Amino acid sequence: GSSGSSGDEGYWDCSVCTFRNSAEAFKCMMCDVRKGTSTRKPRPVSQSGPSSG
Ligand SMILES: [Zn+2]
């Protein structure tokens, strides 16, 4: 189709509307559905205290 990488390639294929979105685009453009999972690992967490005894 087109030849000439302006910045950085990496288009992601949406799942909700199955539309083609560009990497630069934070979220979808067709359905506008958020893609950034932003999931939190089940890893443990404790109160942040003094690193040094
Ligand atoms: Zn979409």
CB-CB neighbours of 21 under 10 Å: 20
Q: Give residues whose Cβ lies within 5 Å of ion ligand 1.
A: 14, 16-17, 19, 28, 30-31, 33
Chain breaks in the chain (C to N over 2.5 A) after: none
Q: State how many domains the chain has.
A: 1
Q: How far apart are CA 8 and CA 51, in angstroms?
A: 39
Three-class SS of residue 20? strand
Structure determined via: NMR
Three-class SS of residue 12? strand
The whole domain housing 6 covers: 1-53
> How far is the centre of ligand 1, averaged over its atoms, from the C-alpha of 25 (Å)?
11
Evaluate whether 41 touches 48 at the Cβ level (below 8 Å): no
Contacts with 12 (C-beta within 8 Å, 6 or more apart), sequence order: 21, 23, 35
Query: What torsion do the CA atoms of 49, 37, 12, 19 make, to the nearest 10 degrees?
Result: -160
